[PDB]
Each structure stands twice: as C-alpha cells, then as structure tokens.
Write a protein that binds this ligand. Structure first.
Ligand SMILES: Cc1cc2nc3c(=O)[nH]c(=O)nc-3n(C[C@H](O)[C@H](O)[C@H](O)COP(=O)(O)OP(=O)(O)OC[C@H]3O[C@@H](n4cnc5c(N)ncnc54)[C@H](O)[C@@H]3O)c2cc1C
Ligand SMILES: Cc1nc2c(=O)[nH]c(=O)nc-2n(C[C@H](O)[C@H](O)[C@H](O)CO)c1C
Ligand code: SF4
Length: 508
C-alpha cells in the first residue's frame, strides 16, 4: 500500500538489476548515495571515483526519464550522513515505506553489515542475477571437490550457457584452445590506436569535483577516457569486437613498453559496474566467429576469461569469505616498497606498470600477475598491503574480483585455492614476453651483483625458502630439482643477495 524503497549501489547500474525489475513506479522510490564511507574505505584512484559517480548520476537520470522517483544524495549535500546505512535510515524517515528491496552487493563486509541493520521495515535481499553462476550454484558445484580447478568449472559454464556449443559438443571438438607458444611482439609490429571516450558534460562536472575534493587520492585524472553510460560502453565494445578481437589470442600475454592496452578489450571497468552485460558480450563474440569475422581460438580465449575466470573468482570469494581474507599461507610479513606508489624504481618493467596504473588506472592481466604480483610474492610483502595496492590503483577493482586474483592467483597467500601453484618467475620470463629488458639498467642474464636483475635472486630465494611446502604440490617439480643440484655456496650467495634487496627496497 505504501510502496518499496529500492537501493541501487554504485556497481549496480543496470536496467535489469534484480532490485528494479518489479517496481511500482507510482509508489516506489529508488535511493542512490554518493558515499564517502565507500569512497575512502580504500583511497581509490581518482579515475575510479570519476567513473562511478559520473555513471551513477547518468543512471539516475535514465531512471527518472523512465518514470522512477529517485532520491539521489550527492557528495556535496550537507545532510548526507556519509554511509549507505545512515542514508537508508534517513530515507525511511522522510516518507512511509512498506519494505526495503536491494540486490546483494560485491563486498562481504558491506553485505554482512546491511544484513544486520536494524530497520523499522523488512528488508528483502535479492541475488545479483547479472552474473551467470549464482552463489548457491557455485557452492553446489564445489561440494565434495578436493581441489577447485577453473578448467572443470569452465566446461560446466559452457554447457549451462550454450556458448560455443554445436549440439552437445564444443565447437571445434576441444573445450580449450590455449596455445603454449606465446611470444613477445615482433620488433616492427606497432600496437593499434585504441578508442577512448572524451568526457561528456556530466563526466566533466565530476572530474572537476574529484580534482578539487580528493586531491590526495592516487593517480592522474587528466586524460580520463573510460565510458560512463551504456552508449559509450557499447562503442568501446564495438571497437574491440570489430578491430581487436581477431588478434586477441595471439598477443594475450605479451608486454610492450609504454603500450599498456595492446589488443585487450578494456571493458572491465564498465562491466564491473553494470554498463555491459556478460552474456551479451559473449554472444557478440560468438557471433563474430560464427559469421567468419574472427578465428575460433581468439573468441574462445576471450569467452573463457568472462564465463570461466570472472565467474570462478566470484564463486571462490563468496564460498570462502570471511576466512579467505585472513589467510597468509606463506607467512609473508614484509612492507610494500614505496616505488609501488611513486614509480621511482630502476626496474623498467615495474616502473612501466606503475606508470600505466597512475596515468590510466589500468594494466592488463599478465602485467598485474607476472610483474607487480609476482614481485610482491617473491619479496614476501604482507598480503594485506598487496590487496590495498591492487584495490587502489585500478579502475576495475572491487573486493570480490581483486582479492581472489591477488591474495590467490598472484601471491599464493591462499595456499593454492584459486590458482593451484605459485606463479613465481625470474626475469627470464619477463625478458621472453616483453621488450623491457633491453632498455633496463639491470642485466637479466645475471643473478648476483649490483647490476643483476632483482627478480633473479628473489625467485631462487623464494623457491629455496618454501621448498618443503612446494614439494608434493606437484607442479614445482622442475625448479625444485634445479635447486637440489645447486651446491650450497651457490644457494648461500643468492640468499644473501635476496636479503640485501629486501633491505634496499624497504621491505624488511
Ligand atoms: C593481481 C591481479 C589483480 C586483478 N584484479 C582485478 C580487479 O580488481 N578487477 C578485475 O575486473 N579484474 C582483475 N584482474 C583480472 C584481469 O587482470 C582484469 O580483468 C583485466 O586485466 C581487465 O582488462 P580487460 O577488460 O582489457 O580484459 P581482457 O584481457 O580483454 O579480458 C576480457 C574480460 O575477461 C575478464 N577477466 C579476465 N581475466 C580475469 C580474471 N583473472 N578474473 C576476473 N575476470 C577476468 C574481465 O571481465 C575482462 O574484461 C586481476 C588480475 C590479477 C593478476
Ligand atoms: C568509490 C565508490 N563509491 C560508491 C558510492 O559513492 N556509492 C555506492 O553506492 N557505491 C560506491 N562504490 C561501490 C561500493 O563501495 C562497493 O564496492 C560495491 O557496491 C560492491 O558491491 C564505490 C567503489
Ligand atoms: S632486467 Fe629485470 S628489472 Fe629490468 S625490465 Fe627485465 S625483468 Fe624487469
């Protein structure tokens, strides 16, 4: 009789959100809050603040155009209590409501808090059915499995969604086309220019507000080019499918100095706040293969990242929280080096990754994994400090997707739940996959001395340190044998080198 209060959070900017689907436009009200609690829980990159608040403001206008009564509480409002819970209470004092309806969110701590709120009306929490696997479906799949392997989850999602299925068989006769012959770019191949979205008038307004009011947050705002509404996001997606997808598979793991985008889709910051739909993106990519515009290996590689990795890490997060966020399997206790924030390091690969984070709030997957993620793991940085960095510096970072990729896949702080084996690597890997080392001050062919690439001694120290644990893992057989044949003097030398580096870098 009085209507429902419907909450929409900053990463829920979708017409099809479960909290909106059955609204009574004549009686109901939508609440959206620009919340300083959420904006300072981590000190997010300036560009992430611009993206979320610009997109929120535009989504509110789209709802109003459709006939919704929207209560929009801006960051400038002098009565704004600052928190989601406080603003819910205040909305419930302003007029009569029958219930609150909301969609379960993407942060365990906020979800736990909202479920415990004492409110004068009932609250109904609906699952976020924008994702392709529900929380209960992942738990059912995971029951009774001694280890959770993404590849077997991926096969189930292929069958459930029907993507790249010809009848009951996978297209092409294999599930996966992952190649092992990944290489760096040929010396003459210049990566293509990428479409960036110039700030529209709403985004320009938010840009000025963030510059003036959050000047202490990490990162540059100049040159902001992320999409902030479904039209802008669709343009980015069209550009990727038409222009980039045919080469997606060839260069998925390559790195190139000062070319942070390469052939990646650049859609995660829009997808993670709801401006694009995961099933629609995948259908678009499948159609490009079916109609002869992209090869199957590229399209399968792309889809696997969305219905395989993205749904899998979300499943692990809700299955294992809150204990997951407390695990520190390798007892890492070091500090994060200051160059993660300033970029002021002679390691050319690290400096470039930090530069991309500062200027664009983006780096692609192998850079996050094998450069700054691997380095943090080898240094022994406390996982809390690594999660903080990955949450701050990237525009696509939300806890449900950051934490299993960071505490799990990149640093092995979860002891192998997400990724099975540590992704440890020496400089030889970065040299094989990038053009960084020819321009670097350090010599990637050396392990000891002031000119040695720091990854090389750090890698062997890490293997040495954890040799008993990594033994019986199964997938570390080759490094452990190599270490085993090393005379004690060789091992003592790289131990003392690794110790020196941790001091030089401010870790210990
Ligand atoms: C340490 C570390 C931290 C990460 N933190 C985040 C994060 O906070 N947010 C985030 O969205 N991704 C995160 N990733 C995953 C991946 O790096 C990003 O999704 C990707 O770089 C986004 O670029 P893109 O849109 O150009 O992706 P593409 O290379 O074009 O891939 C297509 C899509 O696949 C999905 N995807 C690919 N890899 C993953 C993955 N491992 N997990 C989840 N989705 C994936 C994304 O939706 C992405 O848009 C992290 C990976 C690592 C190693
Ligand atoms: C920066 C930021 N700001 C807001 C905000 O002002 N209002 C809001 O409702 N949500 C915001 N968010 C997203 C949440 O803090 C959180 O990460 C997601 O809702 C996870 O579900 C973020 C990340
Ligand atoms: S030599 Fe070492 S530090 Fe320098 S770019 Fe190569 S991997 Fe990075």
């Amino acid at each position: 009789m009085a209507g429902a209060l419907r909450l929409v959070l900053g990463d829920q900017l979708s017409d099809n959100l479960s909290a909106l689907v059955d609204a009574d436009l004549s009686r109901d009200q939508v609440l959206m809050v620009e919340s300083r609690v959420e904006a300072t829980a981590w000190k997010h990159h300036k560009q992430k603040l611009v993206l979320v608040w610009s997109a929120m403001r535009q989504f509110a206008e789209r709802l109003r155009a459709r006939g919704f009564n929207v209560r929009y509480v801006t960051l400038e409002d002098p009565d704004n209590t600052g928190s989601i819970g406080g603003e819910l209470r205040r909305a419930l004092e302003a007029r009569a409501f029958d219930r609150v309806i909301r969609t379960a969110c993407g942060k365990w701590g906020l979800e736990s808090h909202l479920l415990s709120l004492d409110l004068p009306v009932p609250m109904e929490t609906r699952e976020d059915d924008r994702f392709l696997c529900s929380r209960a479906q992942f738990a059912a799949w995971a029951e009774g499995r001694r280890e959770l392997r993404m590849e077997f989850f991926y096969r189930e999602m292929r069958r459930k969604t029907g993507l790249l299925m010809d009848g009951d068989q996978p297209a092409g006769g294999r599930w996966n086309f992952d190649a092992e012959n990944r290489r760096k770019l040929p010396p003459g191949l210049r990566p293509p220019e990428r479409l960036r979205i110039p700030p529209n008038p709403t985004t320009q307004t938010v840009l000025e507000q963030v510059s003036r009011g959050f000047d202490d947050h990490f990162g540059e705002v100049e040159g902001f080019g992320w999409p902030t509404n479904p039209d802008e996001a669709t343009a980015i997606l069209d550009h990727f499918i038409a222009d980039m997808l045919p080469s997606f598979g060839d260069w998925q793991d390559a790195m190139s100095w000062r070319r942070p985008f390469l052939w990646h889709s650049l859609i995660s910051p829009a997808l993670n706040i709801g401006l694009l739909d995961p099933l629609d993106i995948c259908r678009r990519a499948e159609a490009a293969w079916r109609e002869g515009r992209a090869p199957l290996n590229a399209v399968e590689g792309f889809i696997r990242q969305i219905i395989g990795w993205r749904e899998f890490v979300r499943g692990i997060y809700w299955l294992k929280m809150p204990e997951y966020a407390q695990r520190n399997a390798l007892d890492a206790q070091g500090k994060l080096p200051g160059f993660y924030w300033t970029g002021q390091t002679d390691m050319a690969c690290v400096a470039d990754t930090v530069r991309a984070a500062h200027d664009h709030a983006y780096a692609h997957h192998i850079q996050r994994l094998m450069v700054t993620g691997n380095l943090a793991m080898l240094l022994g940085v406390h996982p809390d400090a690594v999660d903080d960095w990955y949450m701050v510096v990237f525009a696509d970072a939300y806890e449900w997707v950051e934490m299993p990729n960071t505490r799990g896949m990149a640093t092995f702080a979860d002891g192998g739940i997400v990724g099975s084996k540590p992704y440890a690597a020496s400089g030889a890997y970065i040299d094989r996959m990038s053009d960084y080392c020819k321009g670097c001050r350090y010599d990637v062919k050396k392990r000891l001395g002031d000119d040695a690439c720091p990854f090389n001694a750090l890698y062997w120290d890490f293997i040495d340190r954890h040799a008993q644990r990594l033994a019986g893992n199964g997938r570390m057989m080759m490094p452990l044998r190599t270490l085993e044949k090393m005379p004690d003097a060789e091992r003592e030398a790289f131990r003392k080198q690794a110790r020196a580096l941790r001091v030089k870098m401010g870790v210990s």
